[PDB]
C-alpha cells in the first residue's frame, strides 16, 4: 500500500478536462474509415471562404433583398452604404464569419470585404470604399471618408473588388461581442464618379457584398453563442 494525500478539487467534474476512461465496450472493432472529400481540421480553415452579407438590412422580414445593395444612375458625390465593424453583431452577425466569431471571446486579424457588381455589361461606375480606423466618427461625406484606408474601384471586366480592413489596433485582441474600448472602425462606400447605364436600360443595379477573414486572423477563448437557445428538450 503506497501512501497518498488527496488535494482540493478531488471528485470534481470539469467539462473541459481531458483524461482516460474505461471503455464500456471492451474489444469492439469500429467500422473501417473510407475516404470522404471535404475534411475540416480547423474552424480557421472555413472562415476564409467568403459568404454574402445582408448589408441592406432595412427590410422588415428576412428577404433575398437585404443581400442587395442598390446603386442609382447619375448620382455624384453621394454615399452608397455605411456600417460599423462589430463583426459579432448587426450585418455581420448571420454570416459564416459572424457566426463562428460568436463561438469565441476574442478575435484579432485582417478582414477581407469584397463587392461583386451585377449591372449590365455596357454600364460603368467608379466607387470608393473607405475603412475608418477607431477614433473618428463614421465619415459623413467622401472628403472625410477618403482620408482613411480606401480603394477607388473601377467597374470593369473584372467583376469583384477585394478590400482588406488591415488590422489597425493598439490592443492586440478585440472582443467579438460589442466592446467600446475594443471597437474597430467603420466601413463606408461613395460614388467616386457615378454609375452610368447604357441606352435602353433602366432602374437600379445592385452590388453583392461578401466577408471572409484573412490568413492573419486569430480567434480565442471559446464560449457559448447567443445565436441559439431553447425552452424544452426536443423529442423525436
Amino acid at each position: 500500500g503506497l501512501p497518498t494525500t488527496t488535494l482540493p478539487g478531488s471528485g470534481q467534474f470539469l467539462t473541459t478536462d481531458d483524461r482516460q476512461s474505461p471503455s464500456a465496450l471492451p474489444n469492439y472493432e469500429p467500422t473501417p474509415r473510407i475516404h470522404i472529400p471535404g475534411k475540416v481540421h480547423n474552424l480557421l480553415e472555413i472562415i476564409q471562404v467568403d459568404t454574402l452579407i445582408p448589408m441592406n438590412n432595412t427590410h422588415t422580414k428576412d428577404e433575398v433583398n437585404s443581400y442587395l445593395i442598390p446603386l442609382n444612375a447619375n448620382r455624384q458625390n453621394e454615399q452608397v452604404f455605411g456600417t460599423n465593424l462589430f463583426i459579432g453583431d448587426g450585418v455581420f452577425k448571420t454570416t459564416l464569419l459572424g457566426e463562428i466569431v460568436q463561438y469565441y471571446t476574442h478575435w484579432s486579424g485582417s478582414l477581407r470585404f469584397s463587392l461583386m457588381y451585377t449591372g449590365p455589361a455596357l454600364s460603368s461606375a467608379k466607387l470608393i470604399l473607405a475603412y475608418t480606423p477607431p477614433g473618428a466618427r463614421g465619415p459623413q461625406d467622401r472628403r472625410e471618408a477618403m482620408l482613411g484606408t480606401h480603394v477607388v474601384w473601377d467597374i470593369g471586366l473584372q467583376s469583384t473588388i477585394v478590400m482588406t480592413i488591415p488590422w489597425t489596433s493598439g490592443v492586440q485582441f478585440r472582443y467579438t461581442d460589442p466592446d467600446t474600448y475594443t471597437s474597430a472602425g467603420f466601413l463606408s462606400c461613395w460614388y467616386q464618379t457615378s454609375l452610368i447605364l447604357p441606352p435602353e436600360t433602366t432602374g437600379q443595379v445592385y452590388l453583392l457584398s461578401f466577408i471572409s477573414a484573412c490568413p492573419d486572423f486569430k480567434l480565442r477563448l471559446m464560449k457559448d453563442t447567443q445565436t441559439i437557445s431553447q425552452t424544452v428538450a426536443l423529442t423525436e
Binding site: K39, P215, L234
Partner: protein, 273 residues
Amino acid sequence: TVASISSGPKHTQKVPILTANETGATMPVLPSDSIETRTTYMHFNGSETDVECFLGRAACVHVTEIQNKDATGIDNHREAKLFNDWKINLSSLVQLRKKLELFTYVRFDSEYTILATASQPDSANYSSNLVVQAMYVPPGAPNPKEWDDYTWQSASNPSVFFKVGDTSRFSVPYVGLASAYNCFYDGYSHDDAETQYGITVLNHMGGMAFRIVNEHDEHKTLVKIRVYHRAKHVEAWIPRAPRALPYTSIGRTNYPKNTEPVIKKRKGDIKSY
C-alpha cells in the same frame, strides 16, 4: 511566422485586388496587397479552433428522472418513473447540436459523464443513499419491463452502478454502422411511400436505461439524471451553413412556422453607422 510582411508603394499592371467572384474562389488577398505594411509576427497557432478542441468538451445532452418509491400496486413501472429510459440521441438539446451540424459527417469516440442528484420535495426524516444502475440496452436486446426484471441482470450488456450525488464516467468507441455518423441524410430507409424522412432511421443507436437499485424507504426520493457527452478523437467532413432558425424536432431540419426575422433590421438607413 510572419502575420504581415513589409510592403511599400506599388504602381503596377499586376492588380491582385480585382477578381471575378463568379468563379467560386475566395482569392487569398492580404493587407499588404492594398496598403503599405510593416512586418509583424503571428505569435499564435490556432490551437483552440482545432475541431478536436471545438467538439471536445463535455456538453449536457440529456436530463431524465426516476424515483425510488414503493412499487406495490404499480401497474406500469415505466410509467411511474420507477425506471426511466432514454432513446440515446445527440440532438435533443441544442447547444451541442448546432456545433455538430456545422459538419455533414462526424466520427468520434464518446466519453459520457452521468451526474445524479436527489431531491426530497416532501417531508423526509433523512436523505437515503441510493445507488443508480444505468444499462446499455442496444436494439435487439430485451428491454426492461419492471424496475427489477431479469433484464437488469445485464449479463452481456455493459452496465455501471454509481451512487446518487456522485458521477459515473466511461467511454464508448464510435459505434456507428457506416464510416461516419450522418449529421444529415436526404434519404429514407426504403422506397416506401409513407416511410419517415431524415436520419431518425439511420441513427439507430438503441436506448439507455436507468433505475435505482435500492428498495423503498418510508419517504419518496426523486433522482434526476444528467448525461454529459464529450467527443474524443474527432474527424469531421464537409462544412455547411450554420443553423439560423430554431429547432422543432430530433432529427429533422424543420423550423417553426411564423418564426421571427433572424437578420436584425437596421435602426436607420443602409447608410447608417
